Amino acid sequence: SSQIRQNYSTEVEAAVNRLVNLYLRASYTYLSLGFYFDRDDVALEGVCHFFRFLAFFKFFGAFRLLKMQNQRGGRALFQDLQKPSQDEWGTTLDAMKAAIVLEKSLNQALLDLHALGSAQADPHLCDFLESHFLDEEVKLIKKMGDHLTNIQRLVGSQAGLGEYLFERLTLKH
Amino acid sequence: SSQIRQNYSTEVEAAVNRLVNLYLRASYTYLSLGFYFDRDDVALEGVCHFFRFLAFFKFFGAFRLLKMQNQRGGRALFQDLQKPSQDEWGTTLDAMKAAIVLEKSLNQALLDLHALGSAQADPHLCDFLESHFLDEEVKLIKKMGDHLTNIQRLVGSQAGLGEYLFERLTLKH
Amino acid sequence: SSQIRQNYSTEVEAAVNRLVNLYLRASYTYLSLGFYFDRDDVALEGVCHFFRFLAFFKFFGAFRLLKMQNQRGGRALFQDLQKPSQDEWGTTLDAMKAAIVLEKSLNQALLDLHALGSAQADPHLCDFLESHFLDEEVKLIKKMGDHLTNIQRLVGSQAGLGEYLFERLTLKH
Amino acid sequence: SSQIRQNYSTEVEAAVNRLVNLYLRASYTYLSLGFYFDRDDVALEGVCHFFRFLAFFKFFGAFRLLKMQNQRGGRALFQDLQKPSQDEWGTTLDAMKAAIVLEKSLNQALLDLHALGSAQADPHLCDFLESHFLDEEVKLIKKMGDHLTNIQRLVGSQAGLGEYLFERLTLKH
Amino acid sequence: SSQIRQNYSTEVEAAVNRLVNLYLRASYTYLSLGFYFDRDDVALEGVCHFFRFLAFFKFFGAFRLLKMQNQRGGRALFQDLQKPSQDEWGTTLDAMKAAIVLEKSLNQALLDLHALGSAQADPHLCDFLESHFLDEEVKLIKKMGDHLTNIQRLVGSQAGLGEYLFERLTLKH
Amino acid sequence: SSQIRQNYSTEVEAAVNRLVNLYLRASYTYLSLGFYFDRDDVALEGVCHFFRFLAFFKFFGAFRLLKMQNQRGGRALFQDLQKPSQDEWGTTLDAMKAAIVLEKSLNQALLDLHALGSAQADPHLCDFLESHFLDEEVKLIKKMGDHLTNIQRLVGSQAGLGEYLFERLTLKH
Ligand SMILES: CCN(CC)c1ccc2nc3c4ccccc4c(=O)cc-3oc2c1
Ligand SMILES: CCN(CC)c1ccc2nc3c4ccccc4c(=O)cc-3oc2c1
Ligand SMILES: CCN(CC)c1ccc2nc3c4ccccc4c(=O)cc-3oc2c1
Ligand SMILES: [Cl-]
Ligand SMILES: [Cl-]
Ligand SMILES: [Cl-]
Ligand SMILES: [Cl-]
Ligand SMILES: [Cl-]
Ligand SMILES: [Cl-]
C-alpha cells in the first residue's frame, strides 16, 4: 500500500478529503460574497475586502489539509465543488449571518473529525486540528459575532446610514 | 501635404479634433463643479477636490490627443469651448449624476472614434485609445457608480448628515 | 438595469462568467496535479512546485476576469466546479501533456471570447484580453512545449533517471 | 445673500469673472501656440515648451482668481471660451509678437480691475492683484520683449538659421 | 506538425519571416549610413551616432519578431540580405530623406501584417504589433520629420554652416 | 583622393571589406543557430544563448573592422549578405561542428589578411589583427573544441540524455 503510512485510518483519510471539499466550497462562497460587495450597485469596499481575505484563508486551510494528507500517506481525492448557496447576498447583515452559519458548519466538521481521530487513537491528527484549525475557527467566529452585534446596533431606523458607517469605521478599506 | 502622415484619414483627424473639444469642455465642466463645492455656502472640500482632480485629468486627456494628432501628421484645430451646462450643481448626488452622464458621453465618443479607426484600418489609433483612454474611462465610471450608490444609501431621511458623512469618510480632503 | 454598464453585451457577460468557470476549473486541476507530485510515492518537488504555481496563476486569472465583470457592470454568476479529469496523473510527461491540452483549451476560449468582443464592437473587452491574457497564455504554452521536448529527450531507455534529472536540473525546487 | 461677503462689490465680482474668462482664453491661445510649434513641419521644441508653460501659467492665474472669488463670497460664473485668433501662428517672431499683444491686453485688464478696486475702496482686491498678478505680468512682458529683440536681431538675411539658433540657444529644450 | 502552434496561419508565419528580412535590411542600411557619416571626409559625429543607434534598434526589432515566431510555433526562415541601396549617402538632408522613405516602407509592412492578422482573426499577432512596433514607428517617423524640417530650415544659402550647426546643436555627440 | 590615407593599400582596403562581409555572414549564421535552439521542438536554452552571444560578438568584429577602415581612410563597401548554409541545424553536436568549421574559415581569412598586410609592409593592419582578432579567434576555437569533445563523450548510447546534460551542466542558462 504505502511505505510511510502509519496509524492513519481509511476513515480519517476519507474525512480529510471531505473536509478539503468543505474548505474549498467555503473559499468559493467567500469569493462570491467578495465580488457581490464589489458591485457598483452594492459598493462596500470594506465588506468586499473582509470576504476576499476569507476566500484566501479558507483556500489555505484546504491547502494545509492536503499537505497533511500527503504527510500521513493518504491520497487526496477531489470532488465536484458545489456553487455557493446564493447568487446575491443581500445586506451586510445578511452576508455576515450567512458567514457565521458557514463557519459554524466548518467548525462542526472540524469537531467531528477531531472526535473521529480521538476514537481512532490518532494523536497526530488531533494535534494537527488543535494547532492549526480549532482556535483559528473560534477566533473567526468571535470576530463575526462582534461584527454582527455592531451591524445590528446600527440598523435602528436609518439602515443605509448604519451600513455605510459600519463599512467605513469598522472594516478595513 | 505632410511628410510624415501615413494611414491617417481626414475623418479620424477631424474626429480627434472634436474629441479634444469634448475633453476640454469636460475639463471646464469639472472646473465649475470644483469651484461650486468650494463655495462658503456649499463647503464640501472632498467633493471640491474630486472634481478639481477630474478637471486636470480631462485636460491631460486633451493634451495627449493633441500630441497624438501631431505624431500622426494631422493638424490640431480648436473651436469655441461651450460653457458648462449649469452654473450651480445642486447636491453631491446631483453633481455625481451629472458627472456620470458626462463620462458616459465621453466614453461613447471614444467608442465611436475606435469604431471609425477600425473601419479605416487604423490600428495605431485603435491601440492609442485602448492603451490610454478606454480602461481609464471604465475605471472612472465604475468609481462614480460606486460613489453614487454610497451617496444614495446615505440620503435616507437625514440628507445633510449623509452628505457630510460621505464627504468626510469617502472623499479625500 | 445598471447605472454604469455601457457597450457591454449580455453575450459577453455570460461568456466572461463561463471563462471564470474554466479558469477556476484549471486552478483546481493544477491543485490536484501539484499534490499528486507531492505524494511520497511520486516525490518530484520541482514538478509539484510547477503545478502549484499554475494553480495560483489560474486563480488570479479568474479573479481578474471577475474584477473586470464588475468594472463593466455585468454580474458574476458562479456555477458548480467540475472535479479534475483524473485522480492520478501518471508520469511528468503524462502530466505535462495534460497541462498543454488544458492550456490549449483555455487559449481557444480566450480566442473565442476575443472574437465575440470584436463582433460586438467591444474594444475594452478585446484590449483586456490582449493586455492581460493572450500573451501570458502564449508564453505559458511555449514554456510547456519546451518542457515536453526536454522530457521526451530524456526518456530514452532509462525513464526513471530522465524523470529525476528533469525535475532536478530544469524545474525550480 | 452671503454670510461671508463684506466690502465686495457686484462690479468687482463681475469683473473678476470676466478676467477669469480672459485668462482661460489666454491659456487656450497658448495651448494652440504650443501645439503649432510641435508640428512636424514647424518643429521648434524650445518654442513649443515656452508656450506650453504659458498655457499652464495662465490656467493657474484663472484658478487663483476663482479661489479669491470664493474667498470673498462672490459667485464664479463661466462663459463660453472663444477659440484662439489664429489656427496657424507663422514664425517664432509672429508668435512672440502675438504673445506680447495678448499679454498687454491681460495687463490692461489687470490695471482696469485694480482701478475699479481702488475706486470701490476694496484694498483686499487691490493687494491681491499687486501681490499675485501685476509684477508677474511685468516680468513676463519684459522677458517677451527681450526675446523679440533677440529674434529680430537674428532675422538679418538668413531667417531660417536665425530661427533655429534662437530656439536652440535661448529657449529651453 | 507543432505541439504548441494554435491560431497561427501559414500566411502570418511567412509574412513574419519577410518582415524579419526587412528589419535586418533596414539595420544594414543604417550600419552603412552610420559609417558613411564617420568618414574623415564627411565627419558628422551626431549623424553617425543617430544612424548607428537605428542600426541597433532595427536589429532588435528583427530579434523580437524572431522570438515571437518561435513563441507561436512558427519556423524562422532566413533569406539573403540585400545590400543597401547606396554606397554614399550625400548630405545629412539626403540621408534623413532616405531614412524616412525606409521607415515609411517598414511602417507600411507593419500595417499590412496587422491587416493580415486581423483578417485571420489572430489577436495575439495584432496585439504584438500594436504593443511593440506601431507606436515606436510613429514616434520615429515624427522625430525624422522634425529633423527634416530643421535641416531644411538651415540650408538657406550657407549649406555647410547649416549642416554643421544641425549636427552640433540637435544631434547627440 | 584622401587627406588622411597613408600606407593603406587598395588590396588591404578591399580585403577588409570582404572580411566585414564574412563577419556579418557569420553573425547571421549564429542568429539562425540561436533561434533554431530556441524552437519549442529543440528547446536547448544554453545552446541558444551560446550562439546568440556569438551573433553579437561577430557583429562587433565587423563593427571594429569598419571603424578601422575609416580610421585608415579606406571606404566601407557593403555587399549582399548570403543567408546561412542551413535552415535547420540538427543536434548540438552538428551545430558545434558547423560552428568550428565557420570559425576556422574566419581564422584563415584573418591569417590571409595578416599575410597581405605583412607583404604590403602595413604594420598598423598587422597589429590591429593581432591585438583584436587573432587571439580572440584562437580562444574561441579552443572553447569550441573543448565543447565538441565533451558533447562527443556524452553521446554514448543515450544521445538525448547526453544532449540535455551538456546543455544543463556546461552551457550557461
Ligand atoms: C479550487 C478552486 N478554488 C476555490 C474557488 C480556488 C483555487 C485556488 C485559489 N488560490 C487562491 C490564492 C492563491 C495564491 C494567493 C492568494 C490566493 C487567494 O487569496 C485565494 C485563492 O483562492 C483559490 C480558490
Ligand atoms: C477651461 C479649459 N482650459 C483652457 C484651455 C483648461 C482647463 C484645465 C487646464 N489644466 C491645466 C493643467 C492642470 C494641471 C497641471 C498642469 C496644467 C497645465 O499645464 C495646463 C492646464 O491648462 C488647462 C486649460
Ligand atoms: C547586417 C545585419 N546584421 C547581420 C545579421 C546585423 C546587424 C546589426 C546587429 N546588431 C546587433 C547588436 C546591436 C546592439 C547590441 C547587441 C547586438 C547583438 O547582440 C547582435 C547584433 O547583430 C546584428 C546583426
Ligand atoms: Cl464526477
Ligand atoms: Cl468662431
Ligand atoms: Cl446547481
Ligand atoms: Cl451660452
Ligand atoms: Cl539562396
Ligand atoms: Cl547587388
Numbering used by the authors:
A (entry chain A), B (entry chain A), C (entry chain A), D (entry chain A), E (entry chain A), F (entry chain A): 1 to 173
List sentences quoted exactly from the publication behind this structure.
NR was positioned between two F59 residues, forming π–π stacking interactions in an F59–NR–F59' configuration. Upon comparing the protein structures before and after Nile Red (NR) encapsulation, orientational changes of Phe side chains were observed in NR•Fr‐F6 due to NR binding.
As a scaffold for aromatic cluster design, we chose ferritin as a protein cage platform with a 12 nm outer diameter and an 8 nm inner cavity, composed of 24 subunits. To prove this concept through protein engineering, we focused on a two‐fold symmetric inter‐subunit interface of a recombinant horse spleen apo‐L ferritin (Fr) as a target region for mutagenesis.
